[PDB]
Amino acid sequence: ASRQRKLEALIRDPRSPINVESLLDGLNSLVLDLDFPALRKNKNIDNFLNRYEKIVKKIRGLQMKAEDYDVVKVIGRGAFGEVQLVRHKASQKVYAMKLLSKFEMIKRSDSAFFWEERDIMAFANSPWVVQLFYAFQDDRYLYMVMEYMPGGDLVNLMSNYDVPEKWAKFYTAEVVLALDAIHSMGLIHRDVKPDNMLLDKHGHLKLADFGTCMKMDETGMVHTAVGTPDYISPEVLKSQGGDGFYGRECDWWSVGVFLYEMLVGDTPFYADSLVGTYSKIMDHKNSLCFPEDAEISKHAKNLICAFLTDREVRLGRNGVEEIRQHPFFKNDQWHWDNIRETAAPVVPELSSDIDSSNFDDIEDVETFPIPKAFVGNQLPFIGFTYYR
Amino acid sequence: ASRQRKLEALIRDPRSPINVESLLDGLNSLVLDLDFPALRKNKNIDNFLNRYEKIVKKIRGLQMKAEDYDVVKVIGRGAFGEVQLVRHKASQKVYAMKLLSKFEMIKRSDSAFFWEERDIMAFANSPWVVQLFYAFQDDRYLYMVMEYMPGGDLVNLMSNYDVPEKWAKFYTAEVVLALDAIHSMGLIHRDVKPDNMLLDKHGHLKLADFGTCMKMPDYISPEVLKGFYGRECDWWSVGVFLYEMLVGDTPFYADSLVGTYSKIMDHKNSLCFPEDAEISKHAKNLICAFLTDREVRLGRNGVEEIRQHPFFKNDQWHWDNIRETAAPVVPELSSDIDSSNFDDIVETFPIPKAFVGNQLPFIGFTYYR
Numbered sequence: 001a002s003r004q005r006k007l008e009a010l011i012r013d014p015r016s017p018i019n020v021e022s023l024l025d026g027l028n029s030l031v032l033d034l035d036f037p038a039l040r041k042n043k044n045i046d047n048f049l050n051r052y053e054k055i056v057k058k059i060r061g062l063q064m065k066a067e068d069y070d071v072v073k074v075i076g077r078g079a080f081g082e083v084q085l086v087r088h089k090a091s092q093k094v095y096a097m098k099l100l101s102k103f104e105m106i107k108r109s110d111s112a113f114f115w116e117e118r119d120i121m122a123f124a125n126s127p128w129v130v131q132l133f134y135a136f137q138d139d140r141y142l143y144m145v146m147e148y149m150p151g152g153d154l155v156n157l158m159s160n161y162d163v164p165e166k167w168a169k170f171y172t173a174e175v176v177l178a179l180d181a182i183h184s185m186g187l188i189h190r191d192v193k194p195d196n197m198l199l200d201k202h203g204h205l206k207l208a209d210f211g212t213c214m215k216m217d218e219t220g221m222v223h224t225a226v227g228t229p230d231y232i233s234p235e236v237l238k239s240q241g242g243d244g245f246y247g248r249e250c251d252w253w254s255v256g257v258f259l260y261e262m263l264v265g266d267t268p269f270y271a272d273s274l275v276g277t278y279s280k281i282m283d284h285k286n287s288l289c290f291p292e293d294a295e296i297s298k299h300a301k302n303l304i305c306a307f308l309t310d311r312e313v314r315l316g317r318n319g320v321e322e323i324r325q326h327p328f329f330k331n332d333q334w335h336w337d338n339i340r341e342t343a344a345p346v347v348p349e350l351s352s353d354i355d356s357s358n359f360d361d362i363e364d365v366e367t368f369p370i371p372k373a374f375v376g377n378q379l380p381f382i383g384f385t386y387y388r
Numbered sequence: 389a390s391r392q393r394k395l396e397a398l399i400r401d402p403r404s405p406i407n408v409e410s411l412l413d414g415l416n417s418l419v420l421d422l423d424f425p426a427l428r429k430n431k432n433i434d435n436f437l438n439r440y441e442k443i444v445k446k447i448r449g450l451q452m453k454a455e456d457y458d459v460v461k462v463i464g465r466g467a468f469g470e471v472q473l474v475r476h477k478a479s480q481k482v483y484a485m486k487l488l489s490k491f492e493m494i495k496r497s498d499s500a501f502f503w504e505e506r507d508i509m510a511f512a513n514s515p516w517v518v519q520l521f522y523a524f525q526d527d528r529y530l531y532m533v534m535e536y537m538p539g540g541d542l543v544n545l546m547s548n549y550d551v552p553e554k555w556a557k558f559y560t561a562e563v564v565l566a567l568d569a570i571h572s573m574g575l576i577h578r579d580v581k582p583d584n585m586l587l588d589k590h591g592h593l594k595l596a597d598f599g600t601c602m603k604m605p606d607y608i609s610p611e612v613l614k615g616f617y618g619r620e621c622d623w624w625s626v627g628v629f630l631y632e633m634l635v636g637d638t639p640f641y642a643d644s645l646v647g648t649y650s651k652i653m654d655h656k657n658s659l660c661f662p663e664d665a666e667i668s669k670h671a672k673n674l675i676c677a678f679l680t681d682r683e684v685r686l687g688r689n690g691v692e693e694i695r696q697h698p699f700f701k702n703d704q705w706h707w708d709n710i711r712e713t714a715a716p717v718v719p720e721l722s723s724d725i726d727s728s729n730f731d732d733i734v735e736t737f738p739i740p741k742a743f744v745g746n747q748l749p750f751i752g753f754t755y756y757r
C-alpha cells in the first residue's frame with residue numbers, strides 16, 4: 001500500500017517523534033505513571049498492567065541503563081544534575097555521562113531545554129560539537145552518554161597558562177567556526193563562555209552545554225532563563241525585563257568577551273557585585289577600557305571593539321565572512337579550511353583513559369510522591385531515548 | 389549489542405505484545421484517553437498532546453480505518469456489534485467485517501474475549517478457520533476484516549434443504565476435522581452450533597465466532613450446566629448437530645428454557661429418536677456415543693476413535709482428502725457481493741473529569757497481514 005510505505009518511513013526516521021525507541025518510551029512511561037496501588041483500583045488500569053507486566057520487565061533488562069556503566073568520578077555539576085566520567089562494563093570504553101533529575105526539571109518548570117541539547121549533540125555530525133552516542137532514561141533521571149573530552153574546559157587553560165596572542169588567535173578562530181556551525185543549524189547558543197568550551201584528546205575545541213540553545217524564528221531571532229552575567233550581551237540584559245527579541249549577534253558579543261579575557265587576564269566588565277557587572281555591560285561605550293600594562297596588539301584591540309558594540313552595528317550580523325577576513329586572524333600556521341587538522345597550542349599529556357587531571361574535584365535527592373490519581377510525570381520525557 | 393538483537397527480535401515478532409502496530413495503538417490510546425478539555429489543565433498532559441498533535445493526525449490518516457471500506461449490507465448481528473459485508477475502496481476486494489462496540493464491552497464487563505478470536509483467525513493457517521486479513525480500531529469500535537463466506541451458515545442450509553444422511557456424514561466429518569484443528573491449537577470452543585458453522589464459495593466448512601473460546605442452550609452440554617470441563621463439551625454439540633440434521637428438531641427441545649435445561653440433565657431418559665424419522669443404526673449409535681456423561685464420552689482419547697466409527701464409511705471421500713472432494717450444496721452466486729444465503733437483518737463514552745483509560749484494554753489489537 002502507498003500509505004503503509006509512508007507510515008514505515010516515519011517509524012524508521014530517527015528524527016521522527018514516532019520512532020521505535022520513542023514508542024517504547026511511551027509504553028514505559030505509561031506503565032511508570034499507572035503502576036501504583038491506588039490507580040490499580042481502576043479495572044482498565046489493572047488489566048492493562050497485568051498484560052504488560054512481564055514484557056516491560058524484559059525490555060527494562062534489555063534496554064540501556066545506569067547499571068551498565070561504572071561511575072569513575074564526578075567531573076562537573078549543574079542545576080538539575082551532574083556530569084560523570086564513566087566506563088561501560090561490557091565494552092570497557094570511557095564516556096562522559098550527563099545526568100538530569102526529572103523531579104527538579106518538573107518542580108522548577110523547565111523540561112523542554114534538553115530536546116535541542118540532545119538533537120545538537122546527536123545529529124550535528126560536526127567536529128566542533130560534542131557527539132552524543134546514547135541517550136536513555138529511568139524513573140528518576142535522563143542520561144546523555146557523550147565522547148569524553150580529557151583536555152578540559154578553557155577556564156582550566158587560562159588559570160594554568162599565561163595565554164599569548166598566537167594561542168588566542170587559534171582558540172578564537174575555533175570558537176568562530178564552532179558558532180558558525182551552530183548558527184548554520186538554525187540555533188542561537190545564548191551562553192557562550194570558557195566553561196562551555198572543551199578541549200579534546202588532541203587539544204582542539206568542541207562546544208558542550210547546549211541547555212540555553214533555542215531554535216531561531218523565521219527572521220533569525222528568539223523571544224527565559226540566563227547564564228552567568230560576565231559574558232551576557234546588553235540586548236539580552238533588556239529583553240529579560242518584559243518580552244524583547246535578539247539574534248545571533250549576542251553570541252558574537254561573548255567571543256569579544258572571550259578574546260578579552262585570554263589576552264588581558266580578567267573580564268572586561270568585571271565587578272565585585274553582580275549589579276556592578278550588569279551596569280558596566282549596559283555602559284559598554286564608556287566602561288570598556290584596555291589596561292595600559294596589558295600585552296595586546298592593535299588588530300586584537302580592533303576585533304574586541306568590533307564585537308563589543310551595540311547589536312545594530314556589531315561584527316557578525318552579515319555572516320561569518322567579515323569576521324574571517326579580519327586582519328588579527330592572519331598567520332603563518334593555519335588557514336580556515338584546515339585549522340582543526342593543524343597542531344594545537346596545548347596538547348594534553350594524559351596518563352590513562354580515565355585521566356581527569358584537567359578537571360577540578362567536585363564537592364558533594366528527593367523523588368516524586370506516590371500520587372493519588374493520574375499525574376503523568378513521565379509524559380514530558382517520552383521520545384528522549386536514542387541509540388546510534 | 390547482544391541485548392539489542394533480542395530487543396529487535398521481540399518488536400519484529402507479530403505474536404509479541406510490543407510489535408510496531410501494538411506500540412502505535414499505545415500512542416493512539418494514550419492521546420485518546422488524555423485529549424479532553426479538563427485533563428489539559430494538567431501541564432504535563434497539555435505539553436505532551438501538543439508535541440504529538442500533528443503526527444497522531446498524520447498516523448490516523450495513513451493507518452487503516454472504516455472510511456476505507458464501503459458498507460454493502462449488514463449480514464449478521466451480535467451482542468456487542470454487527471457483521472458487515474464490505475468492499476475495500478482502493479482494491480475493490482469483498483470482505484466480511486465484524487464490528488465490536490468498545491462502550492458495550494466495557495459496560496457489560498467482557499473485554500478479553502476478542503484476543504483469542506483475533507489470534508485464532510489471524511494465526512491458525514488452517515482451511516477449517518475463517519482467515520483474518522486485517523484487524524484495526526478507532527475511538528468507538530474494534531474491526532475484524534475476514535474472508536467472506538457467501539455459502540451462509542448451516543441454519544440456512546437445514547431450513548432450505550431436507551438433509552439426507554450422506555450430506556450429514558460430510559458436514560459432520562468436516563466439523564470433526566474443524567474442532568480437531570481448534571483442539572490441536574490448545575483451545576475449547578464452548579459454543580459449537582449451526583450458527584457458527586459457515587459455508588465458503590465452494591460449499592465447504594469453516595468455523596466462525598470464536599468469542600466463547602478459552603485456552604487450555606440447545607447445544608450446551610450437562611457438565612457446563614452447573615466447575616471445570618475439557619474438550620468433550622464440544623463433542624457433545626457434534627452429537628446435537630448430527631441429531632438436528634437427520635431428525636429435523638433439537639433432541640432436548642422444549643417450549644421454555646427451563647424445559648431445555650432439564651432434558652439435557654436427564655439425557656439418559658429424555659433422548660428418544662422419533663419413530664417416523666429416517667435414521668440408520670450407525671448414525672443412531674454415533675449420536676448416543678456423543679450424548680453421554682463426560683467420563684465415558686466419544687472424543688476423550690483423541691479424534692481417532694471418532695474417525696474409525698462405522699457411520700463415517702463411504703465411497704465418496706476419505707479423511708485426508710474430504711475438503712478437496714465435491715461438496716453436497718455448491719452455492720450458485722450471482723456476484724462478489726451476493727448475500728442471498730443470509731437473511732435481512734448507539735451511546736458513547738462520557739467526556740470524563742479525570743483519567744479513566746477506556747482505550748487501555750484495546751492496546752495491541754491492530755494487526756496487518
Ligand SMILES: COc1cccc([C@@H](C)NC(=O)c2ccc(-c3ccnc(F)c3)nc2)c1
Binds near residue numbers: 078080148
Ligand atoms: C541544567 O542541568 C545541568 C546538569 C548537569 C550539568 C550542566 C552543565 C553545567 N554542564 C554541561 O552541560 C556539560 C555537559 C558536558 C560536559 C562534558 C562533555 C564532554 N566531556 C567532558 F569531560 C565533559 N561538560 C559539561 C547542567
Ligand SMILES: COc1cccc([C@@H](C)NC(=O)c2ccc(-c3ccnc(F)c3)nc2)c1
Binds near residue numbers: 465467486488596
Ligand atoms: C461479540 O459480539 C458479537 C458481535 C457481532 C457478531 C457476533 C457473532 C454472533 N457473530 C460472529 O462472530 C460472526 C458470524 C459470521 C461471520 C462471517 C464470517 C465470514 N463470512 C461471513 F459472511 C460471515 N463472522 C463473525 C458477536
